[PDB]
Amino acid sequence: KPFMFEKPFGMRDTLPEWYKTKKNICDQMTEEINLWGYDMIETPTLEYYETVGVVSAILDQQLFKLLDQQGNTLVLRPDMTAPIARLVASSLKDRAYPLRLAYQSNVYRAQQGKPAEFEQLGVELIGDGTASADGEVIALMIAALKRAGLSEFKVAIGHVGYVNALLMDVVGNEQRADRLRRFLYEKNYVGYREHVKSLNLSTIDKSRLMNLLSLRGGRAAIEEARGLIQTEKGKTALAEMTKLYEVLESYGASEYVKFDLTLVLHMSYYTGVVFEGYGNRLGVPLCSGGRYDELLSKFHRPAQATGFGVRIDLLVEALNGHEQTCILFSNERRFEAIELARKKRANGEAVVLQDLAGVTDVDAMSSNYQDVIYCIGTA
Amino acid sequence: MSKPFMFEKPFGMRDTLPEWYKTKKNICDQMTEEINLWGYDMIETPTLEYYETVGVVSAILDQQLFKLLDQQGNTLVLRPDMTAPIARLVASSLKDRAYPLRLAYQSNVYRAQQNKPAEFEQLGVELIGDGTASADGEVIALMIAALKRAGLSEFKVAIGHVGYVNALLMDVVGNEQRADRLRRFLYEKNYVGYREHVKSLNLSTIDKSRLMNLLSLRGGRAAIEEARGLIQTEKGKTALAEMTKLYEVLESYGASEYVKFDLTLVLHMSYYTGVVFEGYGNRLGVPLCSGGRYDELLSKFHRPAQATGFGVRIDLLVEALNNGHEQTCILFSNERRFEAIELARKKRANGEAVVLQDLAGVTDVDAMSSNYQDVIYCIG
């Protein structure tokens, strides 16, 4: 039997000071998000595993699974994108597109000391397939992060359509293509090069595959990328990339981004632009997003969709106490003190109204408050 | 077993659509703002607690707990309430913060899926380590001020006392088991059964009348006076004294108009130890909120303290109190994209919510442009 103080593995408390810090950060971001016309929603803590859980971008082994009392397998929601897809296909079909939805919700991972619960904040833009839409979600993410106080960070932008078009044209085969994509997904670039060299391909085609690794940067990277693939799918992806970069320039967010066409966030979940953001002082992405045009179809309501999610705990970490007044009073002066407090609260000042008879150690307490007012004893 | 259909949600779960979300948010933000003005600090605790520790000491009945097994075979609960998790927090993480502590929360809590929602948002406070009438009055006065700031009007907070009930019942039936049987009728608000049971008991004529007259102790400040005649034990006189001083404190807060007394009130068979209360809107129905003293909980976490507080059921409050796209929409084409972005950039700077929409991305522009308060075209 656990001691009274024990919490299940991966569970964490949020103490007062950390709560205020996190609340201010999130409030800044949701305020920005509302200015761009997104409406906040909520979904249930629990979803079915066999519907929502399996279509989530989170890998099966990372899902928090449980049995309910009737033997169904549920998940504590791994993400907000699939629940939102379910919500949209269910109760928002009468609402025409494009839909702009937002969330700030706890999500969950299988217990493993990595956190099994953490707050995630983000948006989904559904029913708009344009590059203007891809640009909008990235620019909003950038704007929200800045408004949160994160001044140094970098968003890397990849493209599933570009990668597929190049890989398929070179190796002509989905199995061969996935083998290559697997190295990119694991960020095993050395492994990728060696694998390319082992393939039954002309050296010219090997160079095309090798040159994918050099497609990092801005306008000059796009130009280099044009040289590797000129099929129709390649051209479409390339046009989307060109338009997106221009849109981001128009938003004034170009300096925060770079293309990296080696970026693979998932082996199959995303269908177009994908992106990941990092803070200057942690080799872990604190945010990510992308276009996922096949998800809504799975809920019987086909639509293009794109969005982003930000990990709040990682953001708070990448970024980085009683400003209250206490009125201490004796019983005989209760009204006097109640009126003092009422007055100051009416003025926006936080006030703890404290009966002297309810505190054992007065000094220990006066040191937990910015200022102390005494209404003690006899008037 | 076959897979659920794609639209199916686990039993007792509910989505929160955009309009309901905004309404609930405004309400909660008003309450949390008042709460902060009284010196309470918001915290959060995990979604999962151990059953054998927090689960069991919760005020929520065992049959109502949402239990699950972890992958180690341990039983966890989805948190049934915030009071027991806050007690855990207080005795551990915050053990070196001296009493009294004033903590607050706005959190989803969970109930076992029973053929009612199994997940719902609750907001409230705990004031721990202050046993004064000042503290009793404070949490009730804060609740009233928060309810008011959220827009609730003409409501009532009914105040009972566990000590009064227990002293009277005991003094008459003299047996813990006999007293329980009576308390159960009150807990289930079954006066009919209660009257029937009292007349069945082997009691004198004055004693049946005492038990009987308890049911009448429901009204204004006067009710406490009539309560004095039913029991004169020390424990009974003490409970009555706490209620009288409590009323005096509420008067000082100018909260008196909102309070009434219901000495039949039993919120729980054992959990509450003293003053108890519940709030009702002017249309009655189910209580929107409730609270009271729970002076033995912190001891179970090895940091004994007196404690009180309240909780508010947010969904019930939203109901008791009562679409549209306020947003502006700028529709643009390629050639005027820079213009539209700057236009939107400018409006957003003045707190104007703007949807900036590439016309190439809209399937039905008439419907869209119809559903936003204002529409600007940067086309051409």
- 3-class SS string, B34-45: HHHHCCCEECEC
A16 and B CB contact within 8 Å: yes
Experimental method: X-ray
Q: Quick check: B302 contacting A, CB < 8 Å?
A: yes
> Quick one: tokens of A27?
């409030």
CA distances from A189 to A64, A103, A183, A261, B348 (A): 31, 35, 7, 12, 43
Q: Which residue of B has its CA nearest to A27?
A: B29
Check if B326 contacts A (Cβ < 8 Å).
no
For A14, which DSSP code?
B
Residues A63 and A112: beta-carbon distance below 8 Å = no
Is residue B366 packed enough to be buried (19+ CB in 10 Å), middle (13-18) or exposed (0-12)?
exposed
Q: Do A299 and B7 touch (CB under 8 A)?
A: yes
Partners of residue B362 in chain A, C-beta under 8 Å? 97-98, 128
Token pair 């761009």 in the structure block, residue: A36
In this structure, are residues A264 and A272 in contact, taking their beta carbons and an 8 Å threshold? no
A117 touches chain B (CB under 8 A): yes
| Inter-residue contact B326 to B353 (CB < 8 Å) | yes
CB spacing of A51 vs B3 below 8 angstroms: yes
Q: Say how far apart CA B380 and CA B375 lie, in whole Å.
A: 16
Are A327 and A354 in contact, with CB atoms under 8 Å apart? yes
Q: Which domains does chain B have, with CATH numbers?
A: 2-323 (3.30.930.10), 324-380 (3.40.50.12590)
Q: Where do we find the tokens 């108890």?
A: B276
Give B119's contacts in chain A (Cβ within 8 Å).
44-46
C-alpha closest to that of A122 among A319, A306, A314, A317:
A306
Phi/psi at A107 (5° precision): -120, 170
Two structure tokens written together for A76: 């504590």
State both tokens at B131. Answer: 């046993």
Q: Distance from CA of residue B112 to its chain's centroid?
A: 18
Interface contact flag, A1 B52, Cβ < 8 Å: yes
CB B171 within 8 A of CB B233: yes
**Which residues on neighbouring strands pair with residue A374, listed in sequence order?**
A328
Of A8, A67, A129, the CB nearest to B48: A8
A129 DSSP assignment: -
**Chain B nearest C-alpha distance from A217 (Å):** 23
Q: Which residues contact B159 (CB under 8 A, 6 or more apart)?
A: B140, B243, B246, B259, B260, B261, B262, B265, B275, B276, B277
Q: Residue B217, exposed/middle/buried by CB under 10 A (0-12, 13-18, 19+)?
A: buried
B56 vs A contacts (CB less than 8 Å): none
Distance CA(A245)–CA(A218), nearest Å, equals: 8
Q: Which residues of B touch A3 (CB under 8 A)?
A: 53
Distance CA B348, CA B366 (A): 24
Among candidate residues A56, A44, A112, A116, the one with its CA nearest the CA of residue A81: A56
Please indicate if any CB of chain A lies within 8 Å of the CB of B152. no
List the structure tokens of A203. 């050296």
B43: nearest Cα among B18, B67, B79: B79
Say if residues B309 and B127 touch (Cβ distance below 8 Å): yes
Distance CA A44, CA A60 (A): 20
Instruction: Verify whether the Cβ–Cβ distance A357 to B41 is below 8 Å.
Output: no
B130 contacts in chain A (CB < 8 Å): 354-355, 358-359
Q: 3-state secondary structure string, chain B? A: CCCCCCCCCCCCCCCECHHHHHHHHHHHHHHHHHHHHCCCEECECCCEEEHHHHHHHCCCCHHHCEEEECCCCCEEEECCCCHHHHHHHHHCCCCCCCCCEEEEEEEEEECCCCCCCCEEEEEEEEEECCCCHHHHHHHHHHHHHHHHHCCCCCCEEEEEEHHHHHHHHHHHHCCHHHHHHHHHHHHCCCHHHHHHHHHHCCCCHHHHHHHHHHCCCEECCCHHHHHHCCCCCHHHHHHHHHHHHHHHHHHHCCCHHHEEEECCCCCCCCCCCCEEEEEECCCCCCCCEEEECCCCHHHHCCCCCCEEEEEEEHHHHHHHHCCCCCCEEEEECHHHHHHHHHHHHHHHCCCCCEEEEEHHHCCCHHHHHHCCCEEEEECC
Question: Is residue A138 helix, strand or coil?
Answer: helix
* Spatial distance between the Cα atoms of A306 and A293, rounded to a whole number of angstroms: 8
The amino acid sitting at A361 is: D
CA separation for the pair B127, B103 (Å, rounded) = 7
Contacts of A127 (CB under 8 A, 6+ apart): A96, A97, A98, A99, A303, A304, A305, B361, B363
Whether B120 and chain A come into contact, CB under 8 Å, resolves to: no
Tell me whether residue B118 is exposed, middle or buried, using C-beta atoms within 10 angstroms of its C-beta: 0 to 12, 13 to 18, 19 or more.
Answer: buried
Q: Which of A119, A138, A125 is nearest to A81 (CA)?
A: A125
Nearest Cα to Cα of residue A263 among A274, A278, A249: A274
Please give the Cα distance from A98 to A129 (Å, whole number): 10
Q: Report the candidate in A5, A75, A112, A74 with the shortest Cα–Cα distance to residue B49.
A: A5
Residue position matching structure tokens 């003409």: B154
Name the residue among B299, B360, B301 with its Cα closest to residue B85: B301
Side chain identity at A293, as an amino acid letter?
D
Rounded Cα distance between A361 and B308, Å, is: 20
Q: In A, which residues are within 8 Å of B92 by CB distance?
A: 5
Q: Which residue's entry shows tokens 């199916």?
A: B8
Comparing CB atoms, the residue among A40, A106, A351 nearest residue B39 is: A351
Other C-beta atoms lying within 10 Å of the C-beta of residue A269 = 18
A vs B, Cβ pairs < 8 A, gives: 258
Which residues in chain B have Cβ-Cβ distances shorter than 8 Å to A360? 98-99
Asked if A16 lies within 8 A of B103 by C-beta distance, the reply is yes
Cβ contacts of A332 on chain B, cutoff 8 Å: none
Q: Alpha-carbon dihedral of residues A176, A180, A181, A187, nearest 10 degrees?
A: 160
Does B126 touch chain A if contact means CB atoms closer than 8 Å?
no
**A40 and B22 in contact by Cβ < 8 A?**
yes
Would you call B355 and A36 a contact, using CB atoms and an 8 Å cutoff? yes
Residue of chain B whose Cα is closest to the Cα of A74: B10
Residue among B72, B93, B82 nearest B49 (CA): B82
Determine, for residues A358 and B36 on separate chains, whether the beta-carbon distance falls below 8 Å: no
Please tell me the distance from the alpha carbon of residue A46 to that of residue A118, in angstroms, as a whole number: 15
Given a contact cutoff of 8 angstroms between Cβ atoms, the answer to whether B240 and B224 are in contact is yes
Burial A135-166 (b: 16+ CB within 10 A, else e): bbbbbbbbbbbbbbebeebebbbbbbbbbbbb
Contact residues on chain A for B357, CB-CB shorter than 8 A: 98, 128
Is there a contact between A16 and B360 if contact means CB atoms under 8 Å apart? no
B13–A46: do the CB atoms touch at under 8 Å?
yes
A16-21: long-range contacts at Cβ-Cβ below 8 A with a sequence spacing of 24 or more? A16/A321, A16/B41, A16/B42, A16/B43, A16/B103, A17/A321, A18/A316, A19/B41, A19/B42, A19/B43, A19/B44, A20/A321, A20/B41, A20/B42, A21/A316, A21/A320
> Which helix (H) or strand (E) element contains residue A191?
helix A189-198
Count the alpha carbons within 13 Å of B26 in the hemisphere toward its beta carbon: 11
Resolution in Å, one decimal place: 2.0
